[PDB]
Design a protein around this ligand. Sequence first.
Ligand SMILES: [Mg+2]
Lengths: 140, 64
Amino acid sequence: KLGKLQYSLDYDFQNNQLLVGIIQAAELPALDMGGTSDPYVKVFLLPDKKKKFETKVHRKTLNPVFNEQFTFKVPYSELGGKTLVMAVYDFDRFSKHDIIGEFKVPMNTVDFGHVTEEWRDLQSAEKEQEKLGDICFSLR
Amino acid sequence: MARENEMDENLEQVSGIIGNLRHMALDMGNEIDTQNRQIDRIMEKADSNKTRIDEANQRATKML
Ligand SMILES: [Mg+2]
């Protein structure tokens, strides 16, 4: 309900690197005072959360246009089992930056060869039990 | 990228050689033109002397 996100995806086989472009976003819900939020998008490889990339902060727009580009130096063999995460955050100067949305893209569903660029609907990020342990015994 | 660069070097060399080929083609064509003009001159003179020698031969055999 927050809005949609237009992004670009393609792989450069000449340098063996992933080219992820953040085009823009639309119809984002407002969380700030003026009637518009201050959005910025954090993008990182889904498999390992290392070297996350963040875009510049846009002031008071529910339709931010970033038109930015990020490069993930990852071989083509490892790429297949690697996912992409694009999460939209709301900037706040005096508090925690609340997450507006998130989107995950499996690299086995992605087809490289033609330059991909699409709009995808944003969804609410996941917050389960912490322990995840089990004990087995018998009663008689 | 080594594959790509190697190829890049190749294309650069091909570029240079192509430029030299251009220069050579220009010199070639120009000299061909000038030589064609010279050949025209040669045929003019040769026809002139052909007429000269035909008339002269006729006049020479006339007094025989
Ligand atoms: Mg704010």
